[PDB]
Write an enzyme that holds these catalytic residues in place. Structure first.
Site, PDB file in Angstrom:
ATOM      1  N   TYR A  33      49.121  46.475  33.706  1.00 59.48           N
ATOM      2  CA  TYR A  33      48.657  45.050  33.957  1.00 59.48           C
ATOM      3  C   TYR A  33      49.786  44.316  33.008  1.00 59.48           C
ATOM      4  CZ  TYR A  33      45.059  44.036  31.130  1.00 59.48           C
ATOM      5  OH  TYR A  33      44.243  43.538  30.194  1.00 59.48           O
ATOM      6  N   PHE A  43      49.706  36.270  28.467  1.00 53.44           N
ATOM      7  CA  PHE A  43      48.514  35.904  27.700  1.00 53.44           C
ATOM      8  C   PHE A  43      47.600  37.592  27.335  1.00 53.44           C
ATOM      9  CE2 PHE A  43      47.329  35.519  32.536  1.00 53.44           C
ATOM     10  CZ  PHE A  43      46.064  36.855  32.622  1.00 53.44           C
ATOM     11  N   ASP A  44      48.027  38.062  27.845  1.00 53.64           N
ATOM     12  CA  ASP A  44      46.832  39.895  27.843  1.00 53.64           C
ATOM     13  C   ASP A  44      47.847  41.077  28.844  1.00 53.64           C
ATOM     14  OD1 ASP A  44      45.736  41.682  27.634  1.00 53.64           O
ATOM     15  OD2 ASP A  44      44.039  40.953  28.752  1.00 53.64           O
ATOM     16  N   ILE A  63      37.974  39.527  37.042  1.00 56.44           N
ATOM     17  CA  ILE A  63      37.776  38.349  37.541  1.00 56.44           C
ATOM     18  C   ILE A  63      38.292  38.221  39.498  1.00 56.44           C
ATOM     19  CG2 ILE A  63      38.689  36.529  35.653  1.00 56.44           C
ATOM     20  CD1 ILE A  63      41.240  37.150  37.269  1.00 56.44           C
ATOM     21  N   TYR A  95      38.772  32.489  35.991  1.00 60.08           N
ATOM     22  CA  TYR A  95      38.450  31.204  34.533  1.00 60.08           C
ATOM     23  C   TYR A  95      38.338  29.825  35.011  1.00 60.08           C
ATOM     24  CZ  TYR A  95      39.468  35.784  32.623  1.00 60.08           C
ATOM     25  OH  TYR A  95      39.761  37.107  32.234  1.00 60.08           O
ATOM     26  N   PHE A 117      49.520  38.018  37.527  1.00 65.01           N
ATOM     27  CA  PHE A 117      49.697  39.120  37.972  1.00 65.01           C
ATOM     28  C   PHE A 117      50.281  40.201  38.268  1.00 65.01           C
ATOM     29  CE2 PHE A 117      45.722  39.355  34.081  1.00 65.01           C
ATOM     30  CZ  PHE A 117      44.549  38.269  34.599  1.00 65.01           C
TER      31      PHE A 117
END
Length: 125
Positions: A33, A43-44, A63, A95, A117
């Site tokens: 992902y 961010f990731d 999440i 979040y 995502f």
């Protein structure tokens, strides 16, 4: 990529429909992902971490937006093995007002952030 918006705000677009079985709750699965904020900042990503994320789906290990966005929910069909899906996740299913990856009040994921995502459901672990 126009999203289909579910009743909860969780939106998705199946960029590539899977060729295999739908995901099942409690199953340990593998996913690659890339997660980005709405301004395009990544961010990731599994790629940055050099490995897929293997985790148990539908049990609160990730999440809510991931559990619902991969297993499915009202208005959201499950992802199928080998599929590629883009998810738009409202803060309440991510979040929230807290944010994530924080250093004091400054967070990699700002409070109230909508998350994008691109998920590649590889299959079971």
């Amino acid at each position: 990529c126009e999203f289909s918006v579910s009743p909860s705000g969780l939106a998705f677009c199946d960029k590539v429909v899977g060729y295999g079985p739908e995901a099942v709750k409690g199953q340990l699965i593998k996913a690659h992902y890339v997660g980005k904020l709405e301004n395009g900042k990544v961010f990731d990503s599994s790629y940055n971490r050099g490995k897929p994320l293997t985790f148990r789906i539908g049990v609160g290990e990730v999440i809510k937006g991931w559990d619902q966005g991969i297993l499915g929910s009202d208005g959201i069909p499950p992802m199928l093995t080998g599929g590629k899906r883009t998810l738009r996740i409202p803060p309440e299913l991510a979040y929230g007002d807290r944010g994530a990856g924080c250093k004091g009040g400054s967070c990699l994921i700002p409070p109230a952030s909508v998350l994008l995502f691109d998920i590649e459901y590889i299959g079971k672990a």
